[PDB]
Design a protein around this ligand. Structure first.
Ligand SMILES: CC(C)c1cnn2c(NCc3ccccc3)cc(NC[C@H]3CCNC[C@@H]3O)nc12
Lengths: 297, 65, 281
């Protein structure tokens, strides 16, 4: 209640976001005030509160504060000027390979921290990748994030925005791991390289059709146990387009990163740690500093 | 100004946890339930459950307030 | 992960006398507020009486989560009990009744641990008239933000159960002197339950609590396990840490021994005084 409401930052199913000043330090923050019967405080708000109070990484959005009144709660976050979707859709911005390297590096560092603490973001997409004024990407929108690694808990499979949903989720995986995030990273990476949604399927079966058409229908040698998934339906044997035909400007190291991120086998799909260890990030050019990342203004 | 990976050192105030790929060849997976074929198809391997249990068992074992 | 959790950073205390001071401060603050609201009146409860009522209502919380349908996972029960302990660590039983706070802690624990229970199910687990169940739901929703504010918005609770499973895995794989460590489990489980009746959850790490339970089961079984601590856990190379760990486990065991259950006649008197205090709140 020490917060002066400056502007209106957005509206979404569960909440409304405003720019604000913290008067006690005169800071610019984003207040996510939760909207609304006989169920109490919104579970999305509680999920984001409980998970973001346990995480502290430069590339994960900081929950600066929280408060509220009867059954209506509001969460105080770092204010972010833009999200990666605005950079991707800004035809005036040129995404050099170094800028893509910087974005992927910050995303994978935030995701490595997040996965080391056994949390799946599970809603990764360019909107949820916010950029502060200093060029530091942060993961945001933890309303679907869930702790993984526990056999005793079943997870939903309708949980990642369809265009970035991994094939095990489209096939209906109830138990999964970091792959569902890393696939989305690949999709984000692909979109960073194409400036267009990589796999923009209209439905779940259309999403699977797009995936298999772009990358080949997976065999049981590529993805063992694939048929065990609850919603597995056999598809046409698409040859798939070679990645250098999709990403014409991608070097062989970037193609190796992309291929690792897009493995159909969620166990063989690279994690954030080993994605960060790949030679793509070690090679030249170095990732651009945050102060030099492109700013959609 | 090239990136070099750093293993992201975080202090667990407890004993060393064996690495996730070390777990099977050190015999830990003999003592956890094997992942079902659906769980393997999703990316759950029971190395995750074993690793998380071992990490929680050692997280702050040597820590005092 | 506990080692950088808010539980470690804010809700693990140096000694049981800091807990006593916090609770005495809460009792004193309610007294001072009520006197400033309209001093040595016997209507108030003394901090040890508040402690007895907190122990009694903690036990009722365990019972409520025991008979809860659908079956409540043990992590939810632990989370609710931790919430109850923290709330009444900084709050008076005379201001917020422990029955409604008990149910509110269970409700918030169910939401926080992703145990998707609809509010009608939750209040259907109350052995009451349906009108009383709706009244109890209204009170639960009324107090929920209050609980979250009194927890300082730290909702993740690290229980000793997962570290218990991890220690059992580690004993099976690395400590072959102990054949079938699962013989410990039940007895260790019992000791773990006893630790939950004490203030250990606010004083020790969940891994220390789990290790104490396992070693106490083993000692109760006639099994020595200094070799597990020193060589298997590599405390042979750091004797200061081994001494610290053994002291922690010894003090946890003593803190379990000096635990006293709430006496039924004492609790009846204190409950009547509590109702008198809340009637004239
Ligand atoms: C709540 C918090 C994480 C936050 C901090 N800054 N900020 C801004 N800033 C303005 C803005 C405009 C356009 C694109 C991105 C950001 C907008 C915003 N909108 C709410 C959602 C919308 C979808 N993407 C994730 C956002 O949190 N949420 C936030």
């Amino acid at each position: 209640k020490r917060y002066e409401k400056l502007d209106f930052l957005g509206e979404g199913q569960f909440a409304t976001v405003y720019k604000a000043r913290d008067k006690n330090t005169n800071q610019i923050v984003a207040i996510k005030k939760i909207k609304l019967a006989k169920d109490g405080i919104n579970r999305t708000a509680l999920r984001e509160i409980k998970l973001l109070q346990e995480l502290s990484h430069p590339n994960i959005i900081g929950l600066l504060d929280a408060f509220g009144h009867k059954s209506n709660i509001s969460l105080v976050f770092d204010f972010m000027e833009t999200d990666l979707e605005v950079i991707i859709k800004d035809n005036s911005l040129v995404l050099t390979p170094s800028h893509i390297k910087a974005y992927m590096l910050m995303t994978l560092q935030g995701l490595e921290y997040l996965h080391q603490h056994w949390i799946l973001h599970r809603d990764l997409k360019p909107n949820n990748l916010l950029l502060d004024e200093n060029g530091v990407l942060k993961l945001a929108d933890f309303g679907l994030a869930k702790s993984f690694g526990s056999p005793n808990r079943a997870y939903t499979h309708q949980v990642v925005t369809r265009w970035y949903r991994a094939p095990e989720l489209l096939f209906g995986a109830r138990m999964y791991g970091v792959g569902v995030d890393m696939w989305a990273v690949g999709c984000i990476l692909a979109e960073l390289l194409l400036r267009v949604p990589f796999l923009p399927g209209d439905s779940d079966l259309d999403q699977l059709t797009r995936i298999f058409e772009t990358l080949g229908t997976p065999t049981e040698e590529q993805w063992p146990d694939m048929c065990s998934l609850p919603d597995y339906v056999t598809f046409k044997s698409f040859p798939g387009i070679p990645l250098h035909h999709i990403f014409s400007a991608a070097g062989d190291d970037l193609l190796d990163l992309i291929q690792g991120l897009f493995l159909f086998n969620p166990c063989a799909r690279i994690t954030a740690t080993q994605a960060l260890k790949m030679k793509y990030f070690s090679n030249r050019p170095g990732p651009t500093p945050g102060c030099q990342l492109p700013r959609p203004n | 100004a090239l990136y070099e990976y750093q293993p992201l050192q975080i202090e667990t105030y407890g004993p060393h946890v064996p690495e996730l790929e070390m777990l099977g060849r050190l015999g830990y997976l003999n003592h956890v339930r094997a992942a079902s074929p659906q769980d393997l198809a999703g990316g759950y391997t029971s190395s995750l459950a074993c690793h998380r249990a071992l990490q929680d068992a050692f997280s702050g074992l040597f820590w005092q307030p | 992960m506990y080692h950088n959790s808010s539980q470690k950073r804010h809700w693990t205390f140096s000694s049981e006398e800091q807990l006593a001071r916090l609770r005495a401060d809460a009792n004193r603050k309610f007294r001072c507020k009520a006197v400033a609201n309209g001093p040595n009146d016997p209507v108030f409860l003394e901090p040890h009486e508040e402690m007895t009522l907190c122990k009694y209502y903690e036990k009722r919380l365990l019972e409520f989560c025991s008979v809860f349908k659908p079956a409540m996972p043990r992590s939810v029960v632990g989370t609710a009990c931790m919430y109850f302990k923290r709330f009444y660590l900084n709050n008076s039983v005379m201001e917020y009744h422990p029955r409604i706070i008990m149910l509110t802690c269970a409700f918030l624990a169910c939401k926080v641990d992703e145990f998707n229970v609809s509010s009608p199910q939750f209040v259907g687990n109350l052995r009451e008239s349906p009108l009383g169940q709706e009244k109890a739901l209204e009170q639960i929703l009324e107090y929920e933000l209050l609980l979250i504010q009194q927890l300082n918005f730290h909702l993740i609770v690290h229980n000793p159960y997962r570290p218990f499973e991890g220690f059992l895995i580690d004993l099976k794989t690395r400590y072959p002197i102990l054949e079938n460590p699962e013989i410990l489990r039940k007895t260790a489980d019992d000791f773990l339950n006893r630790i939950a009746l004490t203030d250990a959850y606010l004083l020790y790490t969940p891994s220390q609590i789990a290790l104490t339970a396992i070693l106490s089961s083993a000692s109760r079984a006639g099994i020595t396990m200094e070799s597990y601590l020193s060589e298997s856990l590599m405390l042979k190379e750091n004797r200061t840490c081994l001494s610290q760990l053994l002291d922690i486990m010894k003090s946890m065991r003593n803190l379990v021994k000096k635990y006293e259950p709430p006496r039924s006649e004492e609790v009846a008197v204190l409950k009547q005084k509590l109702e008198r205090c809340h009637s004239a709140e």
